[PDB]
Every structure is written in structure tokens, then in C-alpha cells.
Amino acid sequence: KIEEGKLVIWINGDKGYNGLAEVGKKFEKDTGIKVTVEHPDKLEEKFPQVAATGDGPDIIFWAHDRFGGYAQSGLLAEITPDKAFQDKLYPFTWDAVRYNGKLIAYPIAVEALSLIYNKDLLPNPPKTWEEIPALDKELKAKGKSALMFNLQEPYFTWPLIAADGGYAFKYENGKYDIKDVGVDNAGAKAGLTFLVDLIKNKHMNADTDYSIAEAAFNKGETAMTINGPWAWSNIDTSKVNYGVTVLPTFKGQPSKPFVGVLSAGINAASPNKELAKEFLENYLLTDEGLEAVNKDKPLGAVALKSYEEELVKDPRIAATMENAQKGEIMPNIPQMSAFWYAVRTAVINAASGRQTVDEALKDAQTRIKEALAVQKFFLEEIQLGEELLAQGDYEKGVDHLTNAIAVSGQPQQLLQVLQQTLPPPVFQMLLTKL
Ligand SMILES: OC[C@H]1O[C@H](O[C@H]2[C@H](O)[C@@H](O)[C@@H](O)O[C@@H]2CO)[C@H](O)[C@@H](O)[C@@H]1O
Numbered sequence: 391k392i393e394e395g396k397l398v399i400w401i402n403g404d405k406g407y408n409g410l411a412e413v414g415k416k417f418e419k420d421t422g423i424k425v426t427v428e429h430p431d432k433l434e435e436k437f438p439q440v441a442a443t444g445d446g447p448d449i450i451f452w453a454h455d456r457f458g459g460y461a462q463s464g465l466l467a468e469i470t471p472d473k474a475f476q477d478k479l480y481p482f483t484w485d486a487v488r489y490n491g492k493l494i495a496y497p498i499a500v501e502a503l504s505l506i507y508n509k510d511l512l513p514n515p516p517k518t519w520e521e522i523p524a525l526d527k528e529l530k531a532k533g534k535s536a537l538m539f540n541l542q543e544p545y546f547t548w549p550l551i552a553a554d555g556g557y558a559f560k561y562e563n564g565k566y567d568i569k570d571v572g573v574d575n576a577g578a579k580a581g582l583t584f585l586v587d588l589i590k591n592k593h594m595n596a597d598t599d600y601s602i603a604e605a606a607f608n609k610g611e612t613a614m615t616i617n618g619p620w621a622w623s624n625i626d627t628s629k630v631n632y633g634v635t636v637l638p639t640f641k642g643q644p645s646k647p648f649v650g651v652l653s654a655g656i657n658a659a660s661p662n663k664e665l666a667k668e669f670l671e672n673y674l675l676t677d678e679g680l681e682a683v684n685k686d687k688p689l690g691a692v693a694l695k696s697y698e699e700e701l702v703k704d705p706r707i708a709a710t711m712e713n714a715q716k717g718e719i720m721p722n723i724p725q726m727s728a729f730w731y732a733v734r735t736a737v738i739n740a741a742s743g744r745q746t747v748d749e750a751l752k753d754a755q756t757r758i759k760e761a762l763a764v765q766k767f768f769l770e771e772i773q774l775g776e777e778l779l780a781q782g783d784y785e786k787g788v789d790h791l792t793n794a795i796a797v798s799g800q801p802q803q804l805l806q807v808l809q810q811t812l813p814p815p816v817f818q819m820l821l822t823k824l
Pocket of ligand 1: 545650
């Protein structure tokens with residue numbers, strides 16, 4: 391069951407994973423259960439691949455938006471906290487991790503992007519995106535720049551795209567309408583057009599990523615960046631005199647960050663589920679466990695009420711909640727992964743000049759719709775095939791299964807499984823339809 395009596399933990403490399411290891415060390419000394427904290431690249435994409443074969447980590451930390459996909463694939467254990475435990479965390483944080491009637495993770499912290507600014511270069515931060523070009527020109531004559539932030543992940547560019555009306559999936563009357571995608575509307579195009587104009591007018595570079603922007607801010611070379619609470623401890627070390635504030639408006643509208651609840655899920659494949667539960671409830675989600683993580687890299691506004699009451703007068707936390715309140719909670723629905731992959735490509739293509747903004751966003755909308763149409767078709771044709779076979783209509787069953795095969799990511803493995811599931815002459819019939 392890879393493995394044994396230890397916990398492997400995956401968490402992103404921008405989080406306080408060393409502080410999480412200290413909590414793990416403590417758990418190991420009270421318990422004999424060794425804890426290993428890892429931060430693989432692209433873990434949020436790795437996990438479903440590896441968990442679907444029955445391995446990967448015992449525990450996975452990510453923002454709640456990925457977890458309904460993982461859950462709908464059966465990759466996550468149900469969590470079952472007792473009454474007392476439930477009451478210790480904020481209800482709305484539990485809502486971010488409730489999927490099809492079950493809790494599928496523990497909430498840890500509420501994350502939103504803020505504007506971070508260097509008070510020695512910009513004692514008053516801009517109110518508006520539209521003020522940035524002029525500040526940048528002024529700062530350029532002094533050998534500095536106004537703003538650098540990660541352009542390679544769409545999470546960072548979302549606040550601006552969404553400001554004037556962009557959205558992912560329409561939410562209305564208690565559900566998402568996955569047919570109603572907001573990536574390609576005029577508000578989304580205005581925001582992304584403003585971003586591309588910043589680049590064209592040399593106020594930003596299309597290839598800036600997390601590290602380039604972090605270095606430039608932490609060394610005093612750019613007056614502003616856009617980042618989450620996790621970034622604050624490196625800025626503390628750098629000695630920059632910084633503030634954390636409300637993101638600027640665009641066309642008189644607030645920037646609208648996507649809000650994430652950092653969450654800890656348990657792999658359905660783990661043979662260590664009770665131990666993971668013990669670690670999360672009795673070690674991590676306590677004032678001291680969160681403090682150990684937070685002092686390594688800040689979590690933001692935490693889901694544990696008792697620790698969060700310690701945090702509320704930190705102006706950086708006030709700015710985080712203010713931005714979060716102008717923003718929107720990410721959906722946790724399985725279709726979010728198609729959304730992010732389409733949007734990432736669009737923003738990169740537009741920023742680098744490989745596509746126009748109009749074209750980049752149209753193709754994004756198209757690619758979301760197609761990916762979801764193909765998924766629905768695969769699943770329906772699988773089901774239809776199985777239902778026909780179970781009623782004895784062998785050829786029509788096989789025909790549907792062949793439709794499923796033609797669109798599958800793994801047609802050879804599907805062929806292998808079907809050789810084991812079908813009577814040999816029904817398998818022979820299937821081979822003639824390939
Ligand atoms: O850029 C797409 C990406 O956005 C979010 O990932 C965030 C994550 O929520 C934060 O905790 C932090 O680590 O930064 C990430 C962005 O680089 C979504 O959660 C994720 O699913 C999505 O791919």
C-alpha cells in the first residue's frame with residue numbers, strides 16, 4: 391500500500407514546510423510515527439496521477455479548489471471530526487472542503503493576494519492600476535520599477551482580469567453552471583488587455599515569474615509586488631520597509647482575487663488514515679502547531695478560531711481579509727482544473743505576444759468547453775457500453791466502448807482492462823472496431 395507506519399506529506403514549496411516538519415518531528419517523538427514533508431513541483435497535478443494507482447503521499451495540502459476533482463475521482467478519504475473539533479474552525483472554512491455531502495479535507499487558512507509595497511520608494515501606494523504606468527516612468531529614471539509580479543501562474547493575474555467582470559463558472563441558485571464560463575467576456579478582455587499593455591509599454595516583462603519578482607522586491611529594485619501571506623517572512627528578512635494593502639482598482643472596480651482555503655486532505659489509498667487524522671487534529675490544528683508553520687511562512691487568516699483571534703490586529707492580515715472580501719472563493723468543482731490549464735495558456739500567450747488578448751481568451755473558453763465535453767462523452771459512452779453489455783446487446787456495447795477508447799488518454803490500458811472484462815469473442819469483436 392506504499393507504505394507502512396509513517397506519514398508522507400506533500401505541500402507547496404512556497405509554504406512553511408520546515409515549520410510543518412517541526413510539528414511532524416514532535417509527532418514522531420510522541421508517537422513513533424515518522425513524518426516526512428516534501429514539496430514536489432506540480433504536486434497538485436502529480437497527486438491525481440499517482441493516487442489513482444494507489445500511491446502518493448498520505449496527506450496532501452493545497453487550496454480547496456483542487457479537492458473536488460480529487461474527491462470525485464475517489465482519491466480522498468472522508469474526514470469525520472467530532473463535535474468539539476468542528477467547533478474550533480470557522481464554518482465557512484469547512485464549507486470550502488465539503489463535497490457531495492462529505493468533508494474531504496481539513497481547512498487550515500484563508501489565502502488572498504494583496505498589494506505589497508516598499509514605503510521607501512512609494513510612501514503612498516497607488517489607488518489604481520491606471521496610475522502604475524506614470525509611477526513606473528518616474529521610478530525608472532531612478533533605476534527602479536513600479537511593479538513586478540508572477541505572470542506565469544494565472545492566480546496572480548486573475549485579480550486584474552476579474553476586476554471588470556471576468557469569472558470562472560457562473561454561480562447561481564445553489565450550483566455552478568459549467569456551461570457558463572466567464573473567461574472570454576469583455577471585462578476579462580479589458581483586464582488582460584491592460585496587463586498586455588503594461589508589457590508592451592515596458593512597465594513589465596512577459597517572462598517574470600515568482601522568483602524574479604520576489605528577488606526584485608526583496609532587494610529594493612521594484613516598488614511593488616502582488617503576493618500572498620507566505621511571502622511576508624522573506625520580506626521581513628530582507629529588511630525592506632514594506633506595507634500590505636488593498637489591491638488597486640481597474641476601471642473603478644476592485645481587483646477581485648480568487649480566495650483559497652489552504653486545506654489538508656487524506657489520500658484514499660493511505661493505510662495510515664487514523665494516524666493522519668491524529669496528526670492533523672491533535673498536532674497541526676492547535677495554536678502551537680499553526681504557530682510553528684506560521685513563524686516559518688505566514689498562513690494568512692487561519693481557520694482555527696483561537697489562533698486567528700491572535701492574528702486579527704496585524705494590518706497585513708486585515709489587508710488579506712479586505713482583499714478576500716472583494717474577491718471570490720474559488721469553486722471546488724472537478725472542472726476547475728480545465729479552467730486553470732486553459733487560462734494559464736491564454737495569459738502566457740497574450741503576455742508574450744503569441745496571440746492577441748481576444749484570440750487567447752476565446753481559445754481558453756473553447757478549450758474549457760471541449761475538455762469538459764470530451765470528459766462527459768467518455769463517461770457516458772463507458773456507462774452506455776456497460777449498460778448495453780449487461781443487457782446482452784454485445785455489438786452496440788462494444789461500439790460505445792470504442793467511442794470511449796477513441797477519446798481516452800490511455801487507450802492501450804483500456805484495451806488491457808477490456809480483455810479481462812469481456813467474453814473472448816466479444817473482445818475479438820471490439821478489435822475489429824479499432
Ligand atoms: O495559477 C493557477 C493556480 O492557482 C492556485 O494556486 C495557488 C495556490 O492556491 C496558493 O496556495 C499558492 O501556492 O499559489 C498558487 C498559484 O501559483 C490554485 O489553487 C491552483 O489550483 C491553480 O493551478
